[PDB]
Amino acid sequence: GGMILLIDNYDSFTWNLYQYFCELGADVLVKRNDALTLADIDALKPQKIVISPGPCTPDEAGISLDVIRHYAGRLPILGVCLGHQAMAQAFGGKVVRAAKVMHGKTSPITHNGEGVFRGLANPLTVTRYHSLVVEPDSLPACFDVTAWSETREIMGIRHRQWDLEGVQFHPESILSEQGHQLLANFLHR
């Protein structure tokens, strides 16, 4: 509810998330993936963690993979794009090339109306900034898929037991009412 650790994986969109979460009344702290150890995060005492997008892959995302693996089941974690892929890979996921690389287009995904999608319209139009996707047949059994592209891509995953959730699209909203309601869902679990 209070203190959010946002992990910057060197994207401009981490500051959008900063503003969005601050407008929802959260105490947010933004630390770069290479300027942190896991010992650091114990000092900061976060209530929830968010892994940002970034131009890299999870392997090159500094501590992101280490953080998901160590804090899984201790604090809620929300992965956006890169963070969503990092969440799959963390539990033995496989990230593969997409059918079409999307550099800013908005498109309709279907969801299960649970997790961050509770009280959201289905289908839902979202904006995509990615070229890679989580491979469905490789997805670890600990994860349910929660959203699908219309080309049948994984657009959201969620752990079956713990509070860690991913989205492949950029939430980009909080003045959209159904965009505010998506991040508020993570914040007020």
Residue numbers in the entry: -1 to 187
Reproduce the article's own wording on this structure.
Here, we chose aminodeoxychorismate synthase (ADCS) from Escherichia coli, which consists of a class I glutaminase subunit (PabA) and a synthase subunit (PabB), to investigate the mechanism of glutaminase catalysis regulation and its impact on overall GAT activity. GATs comprise minimally a glutaminase that produces ammonia, which reacts with a synthase-bound substrate to yield specific nitrogen-containing products. As evidenced by analytical gel filtration and isothermal titration calorimetry (ITC) data, the PabA and PabB subunits form a heterodimeric assembly with a dissociation constant KD = 0.16 ± 0.06 μM.
Finally, we assessed whether a catalytically competent conformation of the glutaminase active site requires rigidification by the presence of the synthase subunit PabB, by determining an additional crystal structure of the separate PabA subunit.
